[PDB]
Amino acid sequence: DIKELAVETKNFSGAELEGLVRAAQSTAMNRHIKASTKVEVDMEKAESLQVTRGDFLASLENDIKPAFGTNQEDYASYIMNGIIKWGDPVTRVLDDGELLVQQTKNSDRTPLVSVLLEGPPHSGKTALAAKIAEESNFPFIKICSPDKMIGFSETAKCQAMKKIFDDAYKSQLSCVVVDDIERLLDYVPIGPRFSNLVLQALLVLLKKAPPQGRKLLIIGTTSRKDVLQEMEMLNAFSTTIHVPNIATGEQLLEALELLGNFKDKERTTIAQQVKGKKVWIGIKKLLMLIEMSLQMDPEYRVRKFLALLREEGASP
Amino acid sequence: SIINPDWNFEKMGIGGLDKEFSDIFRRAFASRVFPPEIVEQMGCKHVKGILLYGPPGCGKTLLARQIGKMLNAREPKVVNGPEILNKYVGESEANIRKLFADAEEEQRRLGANSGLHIIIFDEIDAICKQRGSMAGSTGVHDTVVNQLLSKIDGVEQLNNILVIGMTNRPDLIDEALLRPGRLEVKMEIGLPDEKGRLQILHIHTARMRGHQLLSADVDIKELAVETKNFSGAELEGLVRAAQSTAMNRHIKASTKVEVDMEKAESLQVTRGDFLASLENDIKPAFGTNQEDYASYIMNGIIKWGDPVTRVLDDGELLVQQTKNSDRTPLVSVLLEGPPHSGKTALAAKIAEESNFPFIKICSPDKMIGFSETAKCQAMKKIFDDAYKSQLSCVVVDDIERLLDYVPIGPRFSNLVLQALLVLLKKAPPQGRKLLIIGTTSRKDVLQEMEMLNAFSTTIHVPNIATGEQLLEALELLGNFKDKERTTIAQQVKGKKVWIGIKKLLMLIEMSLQMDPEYRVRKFLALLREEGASP
Amino acid sequence: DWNFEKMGIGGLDKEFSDIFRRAFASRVFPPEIVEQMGCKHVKGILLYGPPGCGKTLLARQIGKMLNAREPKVVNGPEILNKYVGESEANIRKLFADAEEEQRRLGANSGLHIIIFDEIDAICKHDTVVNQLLSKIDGVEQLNNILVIGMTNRPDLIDEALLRPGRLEVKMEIGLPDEKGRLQILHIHTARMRGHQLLSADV
Amino acid sequence: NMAGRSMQAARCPTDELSLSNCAVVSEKDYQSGQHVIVRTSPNHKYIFTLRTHPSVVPGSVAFSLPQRKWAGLSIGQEIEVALYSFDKAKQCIGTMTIEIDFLQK
Ligand SMILES: Nc1ncnc2c1ncn2[C@@H]1O[C@H](COP(=O)(O)OP(=O)(O)OP(=O)(O)O)[C@@H](O)[C@H]1O
Ligand SMILES: Nc1ncnc2c1ncn2[C@@H]1O[C@H](COP(=O)(O)OP(=O)(O)OP(=O)(O)O)[C@@H](O)[C@H]1O
Ligand SMILES: Nc1ncnc2c1ncn2[C@@H]1O[C@H](COP(=O)(O)OP(=O)(O)O)[C@@H](O)[C@H]1O
Ligand SMILES: Nc1ncnc2c1ncn2[C@@H]1O[C@H](COP(=O)(O)OP(=O)(O)O)[C@@H](O)[C@H]1O
Ligand SMILES: [Mg+2]
Ligand SMILES: [Mg+2]
Ligand SMILES: [Mg+2]
């Protein structure tokens, strides 16, 4: 049904709706070839040739990747081990995200929206922005990260950022994620030292609106918020969200119960010690200390885990 | 899924590529086999471009030649990337015109019933590369791509052409040559696994098995097991060396060399030849180098106290987690302490005991005189080579010597610090693992740079801090006998010391050149000056 | 069982043997048996070390044992004279002297040793490197050729040339030790000692 | 003994017992010929054969310098000693290959 194929190929050029057909045709003709000495055509398999839906679906999933679409294999290195509900501060973030996602699409007097996710290190901010973006179903999604620009100069990062933004003014509704804002500026506390050529481009690209009738959403993540406030970068954003650490014993036990690592009789011993104090630990560091204590002998795992937790994760 | 044609690769001479061949054929040659009738009734055009990338020696050109021979065609042409740039306009254009001429002539003479004319490029990431954006100091301006692009597709386009490009740097290719209608299929050829190595070895020792030139004690499974991270072009070199070793035993040395003619009737290749060739001749390039464990662990490792065992135990737990965990493929650790306390030797020992098939060391000894723009490239290449293995290990020595840190001002390099901060939190592709170790002596400076939020943990390497530990170290080294040991202990044992192992060795060596009756006093005189009160 | 005293080389015992085993041990066997094995010959070697330590002497004394023709010496700086047509063509007029024997008698050719000094500025120019790489390696090439290179700086040497198929044997010829000096002095004062022209004091 | 007890490493008392390659223990604690396992950490266990000497103070085990260097033992350190039993039907040794060198240069 050609009607159904016109609703799945969003943001496809005209030169790729031709490659799709060619790939489907080539796939269909593979089922009727033979090779014993040198490849030769079977004379009984070239008659009942009928290109079928399955070939189109397979070609669409595997072989064709539009240049103005969602790369569904790049928010897979970011949301690695999933998302779990250890406490309340997760639902709040995931709900503000959907409120902003609906505002950016159903509103006429605000075609541009920005947001900033900030919190202490290791608290799980890069894996929350990716989830917030992945559940919007926008035709265009892109991620600008500093690990694809190793060794670049100041004038070679502005061009890359500007190209990423210019590709997004060609789509009817877009989404862009800017990760580790403090690593793009090349910030080091000694000095301080940074790039004033990238900062002034970023301060301008956050306020410029797309052409008439088009919409855009921007998400940024950082951990040193007290520095961006002296740069006057908190006036370029429309809102801020706080991503917190784990800060009570009950939250720690709930987080442990959902990962499913320690036994019922091994979770009472932990509860006895832990539930007499307050803790300060991030969800990315609580998975590194549950994998070092599982490499020990079965009779010394709890003691090692508690020692590791005490050595670092004390009160704020 | 897709029903594929049935091939056998033992008769073609390729081993381990049971999927790249299939998909390449389906997506680039499944429509040139059918009769032109149905091809016209479908109106399907032909793919006229392929790209292949991977490490050297893994069998890309072989595949292209075999595919070309499979579809009866002329001898494929060949070109080189940097060669075409050796001249300027008015000379390279003629070279370009000298490749497709025969294809044009045959198309004119025949039309729609011509023969395919394959063309094979090489190192195509030089002409098709405007990526001079890397490095603060680099510039590129080229226009050689556009003529090739025009020839491939557009006016006076040819229906009987096929271009295959090969490269080792997939991320330096311009995205103008990858659009739909010019170099559209892409493939990666990687290092083989154990089954692929077995297939390659069985393919390359098939002409001697026919003539009974292979001994009976030669077992190939053990050879496949013992050669880890070997390319396909080094197992061939192994076999060639094992053959050349056996033909030497049957030569008689005289005024002029000549064959034995009596022991040449039983020319056989034995297991000893293969073992000797593996120990002496072949040195893989993505394998562990065993010449770098004698320059770093020089005087062994003795147990002078309790702290010298906790470090080793912790290093074993981290090795067993980067190999058995699926939630943490990348881990890091930092070894720190006061100078002369023995940090490089312990890291080298941990790496050596890891047993991984790839182990590498990054040291400032190999970068004397370099600029930062070149140190970044060297470090990035060292890290890039580690993503082709399924288990790796990288050591980084003297982190404070890479940044060029001097306390006066202070000064350092901000182009290396950011790269090092970004490379410690980038994970390898697919399901591969990696382990990084790093040694430093100035932890406070590293703290002021926010560089301790990049590592996963830390280990403290301490100094000798008691008389008993010093006496134990002296006893284990075995230099001063009981008569002098009692004298030494009657004085040192009544206080606390502060001395590293390296400095202890230096002092013991210095205080042994005096006359036999002054050594014990010279040792204490030196110790008092160097360290006796913290 | 070599007799190194008669050859005229002393202090190089584990280098001569290794070079002969790895690069020359197949060229003294009949083609018939070599065909039954599938072995391919080696067409490159790299020797590096301090100047005047016995690298050309070894090369010329190993090519006479096989009963081959005289080695064809060539210099590095000389080749890069002006430009293409006087250097590239001059490059052609070296392998050319032996490009014929193969096109006349092919297999059963002799073995042409083509010494090539310096090899450290020619390959830092790019024209010569490309021509040499295509000549030794590629689709068209001769099987009766052996190229020997010598350098004094080992690191500057490129890496595109040190791969299997290309120059794949590396050897270091350093200064001699006590025994090497003893043997060299024994070799170089043998004629006089036979004529009783050497005093007993020595 | 069977469960395992904490002990203190000591120095070999006599040269003859040093050459015997048998850990020297007190009569009050063990008996001659008994084989034990010494634990220094979860992943560090070493099997030794015991011999009784009067001079050994109770609560400590004496090892020769080669034994300390092989097992990484330090005098005064704590270890865990547990009685060890061999399976003679399987663990009886028929042939050993030993690399021998001069002890002193
Ligand atoms: N509820 C959760 N919220 C966030 N991350 C979670 C959650 N449960 C598990 N994770 C995992 O915890 C890890 C934390 O995410 P991530 O590594 O992106 O943190 P981060 O704050 O960006 O870290 P860094 O400070 O190093 O940049 C990720 O693997 C994420 O998948
Ligand atoms: N635990 C140890 N026991 C005995 N010898 C050791 C130990 N650790 C190292 N050594 C030896 O002592 C020397 C240690 O020097 P090393 O190269 O480790 O110094 P370092 O700590 O890196 O010092 P630097 O401040 O100069 O960089 C080497 O000879 C090594 O063999
Ligand atoms: N998969 C393989 N199976 C068998 N032989 C191989 C394979 N890969 C490489 N070789 C051997 O390596 C030699 C040269 O490899 P080549 O294809 O030139 O490497 P590259 O792909 O870098 O050009 C060939 O002659 C071939 O015999
Ligand atoms: N091992 C050796 N045994 C005998 N003579 C030697 C030895 N090494 C060098 N010589 C002598 O010293 C000179 C070496 O010259 P040559 O080998 O051409 O130098 P280079 O190493 O620059 O090629 C010759 O005169 C040769 O006879
Ligand atoms: Mg992050
Ligand atoms: Mg060091
Ligand atoms: Mg010479």
What is the topology?
This is part of a larger assembly, with four copies of chain A.
Chain A (H helix, E strand, L loop, with lengths): L1 H4 L11 H12 L4 E2 L5 E2 L11 H10 L26 H18 L5 E7 L7 H9 L7 E3 L9 H13 L9 E3 L2 H4 L11 H10 L10 E7 L2 H4 L11 E3 L6 H11 L4 H11 L26 H12 L4
Parallel strand pairs in A: 3-6, 3-7, 4-5, 5-6
Antiparallel strand pairs in A: 1-2
Helix pairs in contact in A: 2-3, 6-8
Subcellular location (chain C): Cytoplasm
Subunit structure (chain C): Homohexamer. Interacts with GABARAP and GABARAPL2. Interacts with GRIA2. Interacts with PLK2, leading to disrupt the interaction with GRIA2. Interacts with MUSK; may regulate MUSK endocytosis and activity. Interacts with CDK16.
Family (chain C): Belongs to the AAA ATPase family.
- Indicate the percent of residues in helices of chain A: 25-40%
Helices and strands of chain A, in N-to-C order?
HHEEHHEHEHEHHEHEHHH
Q: Helical element count of chain A?
A: 12
The class by helix and strand makeup of chain A works out as alpha/beta
Cα(first) to Cα(last) distance of chain A is: 61 Å
Number of strands of chain A: 7
Instruction: Give the spatial strand order of the biggest sheet of chain A.
Output: 4-5-6-3-7
Binding site for ATP (chain B): 299-304, 339-346
Protein name (chain B): Vesicle-fusing ATPase
Subunit structure (chain B): Homohexamer. Interacts with GABARAP and GABARAPL2. Interacts with GRIA2. Interacts with PLK2, leading to disrupt the interaction with GRIA2. Interacts with MUSK; may regulate MUSK endocytosis and activity. Interacts with CDK16.
Enzyme class (chain B): hydrolase
